[PDB]
Nucleic acid binder design. Structure first.
Ligand SMILES: O=C(O)Cc1cccc(OCCCN(Cc2cccc(C(F)(F)F)c2Cl)CC(c2ccccc2)c2ccccc2)c1
Ligand SMILES: CC1=C(/C=C/C(C)=C\C=C\C(C)=C\C(=O)O)C(C)(C)CCC1
Ligand SMILES: [Zn+2]
Ligand SMILES: [Zn+2]
Ligand SMILES: [Zn+2]
Ligand SMILES: [Zn+2]
Lengths: 12, 369, 317, 10
DNA sequence: TATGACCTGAAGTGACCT
DNA sequence: TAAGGTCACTTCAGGTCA
């Protein structure tokens, strides 16, 4: 649930 | 003196029965009987017809046509008679009122010309009807977002494990290498999807776990769509990142099971008969994200309501572009089911990988586990 | 070539001399005249491959006008002020499908203090559901026979299609049967489930999924027998089933069901443009449910606790 | 295997 | 009740005047 | 000549009724 979330808030 | 008529005739008979035709009727030439039969068949479809007990070998002529109506209609279809050539009830009302009430019959009265003794046309709103502005704006936005998010994956090309050509066929680490490669391509795919959905309007109106659940659920199916879009019909190969092409046997060397690989290729070759453009693909993906039947969804109402505009926008785009093909839309909405089946197959592939104690990347292991 | 002066430059007929700036006959003259006058935009479905000659020139007006304009005819030369300006039926009738649904399901309700059956007990929900399923497989084949063109198919393909779709068929059936109750579903054996019982049985997830995504939506949009039968027909014909002799026929029949259903929607419910699309969108939700139920069916069968009848066993084996 | 075929026959 | 010769009836075409 | 118009002529929809 963490990595997708950190991919959400900003640009990858 | 020459006769003043085009007059195309001469008894070319009938494509249904073979009796004498009076001319072309419903995109084919036929007689009065076949024409009337076809009309009364289209306007009334709930009429009682007898099933064919004599087999589909029923012979058509100027006599036996009254025996089996199903075969008669079926050969009317074989004759190429279109159903849309029969005027509907709302279509026929305007082909009456114009010809009765005033124009061409019983009434002509105007300001000019008048022997009256003893007996804004163009647009209201700036219309032109269907496919409104906001819809096309949304479509173009989705396409532009698709391209913009697609360009980010182009710089990740030499970030990945090279393909081991000329590799030992019995080598396990070769299969492991190809597998790792494809999983990395899948990572790029997932990030690309996340960015795309991020640029999708209305998607930011949901909660964190809502967006996360929707993405985790729709990811594989979106990948299937993007793969079917990158499929090459003639060469029978799939090209990822536009410079990387792979055949079916390449997936066979990847270590993937046949039951996983085959239906995907079936799905990919099935979508080329649709001939979808970037707009329809983008709309399909957009709808697929907004499916409310996904697991772990707290507010399915918001998601369904968000799915509403994309569905009808896809409808207006389909009907206007290709009025000739009316089955394109239901055949497009039906691909979602295939996406579900292939999603189940995908999950079974994941479990298959889990069976051999194989490891997949933390992101992919986050989504599909 | 000065002989071409005596012929039409478009259809290649004998001309009267120049009219619109090219040499053309009275036919192309009057055609370009009547066209440019109203300047009506033609639509040719071929497309754009049309070759215009003397004989066939009146078959396609679009390409004829395009060839007239290509020869150098002017729209400014034309006087009079102006320049530039249902169903598909009887192959797959919905009435016979309705007849099938009415034949198989006797249970309905009209306008006080009555209804056929709703007894209950929360033991054992899974066993009772399997029992009702086995009970309804026979009515499922009996339903399949009354569906147009299915009986004409080869026997083995009929077998395959039934074995493939039986789950989703029965599911849609009891969902629409339970459309009047929340929550939850009424069995064809008459007994009641009551999802609390499903939760206590460990199957509550898929059950509540059925409650949320099927019966709820069906009740919200008020789906009738015709639409239910059509959706069940779409589920019934699957070209993607394994072992099919001629999948294209099945796919074609499915398309026929699409056209017929969309027709019925454009007739019965002119109010809702998204009715048909909604009905189609109920299908992907059904597939994910139909598959998940098989996973539990493969489970409870392999565990060897809940008794399974012979027919249901055959469908599972 | 058996039943469905016979049920589909008649 | 379904059927097909037969009509109503517009939109169109072109040989021949104007 | 080269522009117009007229109106015998075609067409292919639906509707009638014995
Ligand atoms: O090239 C780009 O633009 C980026 C991109 C876009 C879409 C897909 C993609 O990678 C797909 C090709 C490799 N893929 C690996 C894979 C994907 C998803 C799950 C798994 C797994 F972990 F479950 F196994 C794997 Cl191994 C496989 C690919 C495929 C196509 C045809 C036959 C076999 C495999 C695929 C799998 C699932 C969905 C779509 C394609 C890169
Ligand atoms: C949803 C459900 C399941 C499957 C239901 C199926 C496969 C058929 C139901 C048929 C009925 C209920 C027919 C009728 O009423 O006519 C299983 C057992 C996996 C899990 C819990 C309940
Ligand atoms: Zn005929
Ligand atoms: Zn027949
Ligand atoms: Zn000409
Ligand atoms: Zn043309």
């Amino acid at each position: 649930h963490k990595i997708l979330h950190r991919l959400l808030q900003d640009s990858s | 003196k020459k006769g003043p008529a085009p007059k195309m005739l001469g008894h070319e008979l009938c494509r249904v029965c073979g009796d004498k035709a009076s001319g072309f009727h419903y995109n084919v030439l036929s007689c009065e009987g076949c024409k009337g039969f076809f009309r009364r068949s289209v306007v009334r479809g709930g009429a009682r017809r007898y099933a064919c007990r004599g087999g589909g070998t029923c012979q058509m002529d100027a006599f036996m046509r009254r025996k089996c109506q199903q075969c008669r209609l079926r050969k009317c279809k074989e004759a190429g008679m279109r159903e849309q050539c029969v005027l509907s009830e709302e279509q026929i009302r305007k082909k009456k009122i114009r010809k009765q009430q005033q124009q061409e019959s019983q009434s002509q009265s105007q300001s000019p010309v008048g022997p009256q003794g003893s007996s804004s046309q163009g647009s209201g709103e700036g219309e032109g009807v269907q496919l409104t502005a906001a819809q096309e704006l949304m479509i173009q936005q989705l396409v532009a977002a698709q391209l913009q998010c697609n360009k980010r994956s182009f710089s990740d090309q030499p970030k990945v494990t090279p393909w081991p050509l000329g590799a030992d066929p019995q080598s396990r680490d070769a299969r492991q290498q190809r597998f790792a490669h494809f999983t990395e391509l899948a990572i790029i795919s997932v990030q690309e999807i996340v960015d795309f959905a991020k640029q999708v309007p209305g998607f930011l109106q949901l909660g964190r776990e809502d967006q996360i659940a929707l993405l985790k659920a729709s990811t594989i199916e979106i990948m299937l769509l993007e793969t079917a879009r990158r499929y090459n019909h003639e060469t029978e190969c799939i090209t990822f990142l536009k410079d990387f092409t792979y055949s079916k046997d390449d997936f066979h060397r990847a270590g993937l099971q046949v039951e996983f690989i085959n239906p995907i290729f079936e799905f990919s070759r099935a979508m080329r008969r649709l001939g979808l453009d970037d707009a329809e693909y983008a709309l399909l993906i957009a709808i697929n994200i907004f499916s409310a039947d996904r697991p772990n969804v707290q507010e399915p109402g918001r998601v369904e309501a968000l799915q509403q505009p994309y569905v009808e926008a896809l409808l207006s785009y389909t009907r206007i572009k290709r009025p000739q093909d009316q089955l394109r839309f239901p055949r497009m909405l039906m691909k979602l089911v295939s996406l579900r089946t292939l999603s189940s197959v995908h999950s079974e592939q994941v479990f298959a990988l889990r069976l051999q104690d194989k490891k997949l990347p933390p992101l992919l292991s986050e989504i599909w586990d | 070539a000065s002989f071409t002066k005596h012929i039409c430059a478009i259809c290649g007929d004998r001309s009267s001399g120049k009219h619109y700036g090219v040499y053309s006959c009275e036919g192309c003259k009057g055609f370009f005249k009547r066209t440019v006058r109203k300047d009506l935009t033609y639509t040719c479905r071929d497309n754009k491959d049309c070759l215009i000659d003397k004989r066939q020139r009146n078959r396609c007006q679009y390409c004829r006008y395009q060839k007239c304009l290509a020869m150098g005819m002017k729209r400014e030369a034309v006087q009079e002020e102006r320049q530039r300006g249902s169903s598909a039926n009887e192959d797959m009738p919905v009435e016979r499908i309705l007849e099938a649904e009415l034949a198989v399901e006797p249970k309905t309700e009209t306008y006080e203090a009555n209804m056929g059956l709703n007894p209950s007990s929360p033991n054992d929900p899974v066993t009772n559901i399997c029992q009702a399923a086995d009970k309804q497989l026979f009515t499922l084949v009996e339903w399949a026979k009354r569906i147009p063109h299915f009986s004409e198919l080869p026997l083995d393909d009929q077998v395959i299609l039934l074995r493939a779709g039986w789950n989703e068929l029965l599911i849609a059936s009891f969902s629409h049967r339970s459309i009047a109750v929340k929550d939850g579903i009424l069995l064809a054996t008459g007994l009641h489930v009551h999802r609390n019982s499903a939760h206590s049985a460990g199957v509550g997830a898929i059950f509540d999924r059925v409650l949320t995504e099927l019966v709820s939506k069906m009740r919200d949009m008020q789906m009738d027998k015709t639409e239910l039968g059509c959706l069940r027909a779409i589920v019934l014909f699957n070209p993607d089933s394994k072992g099919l002799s001629n999948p294209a026929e099945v796919e074609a029949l499915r398309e026929k069901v699409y056209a017929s259903l969309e027709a019925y929607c454009k007739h019965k419910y002119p109010e809702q443009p998204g009715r048909f699309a909604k009905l189609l969108l109920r299908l992907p939700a059904l597939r994910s449910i139909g598959l998940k139920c098989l996973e539990h069916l493969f489970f409870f069968k392999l565990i060897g606790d809940t008794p399974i009848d012979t027919f249901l066993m055959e469908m599972l084996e």
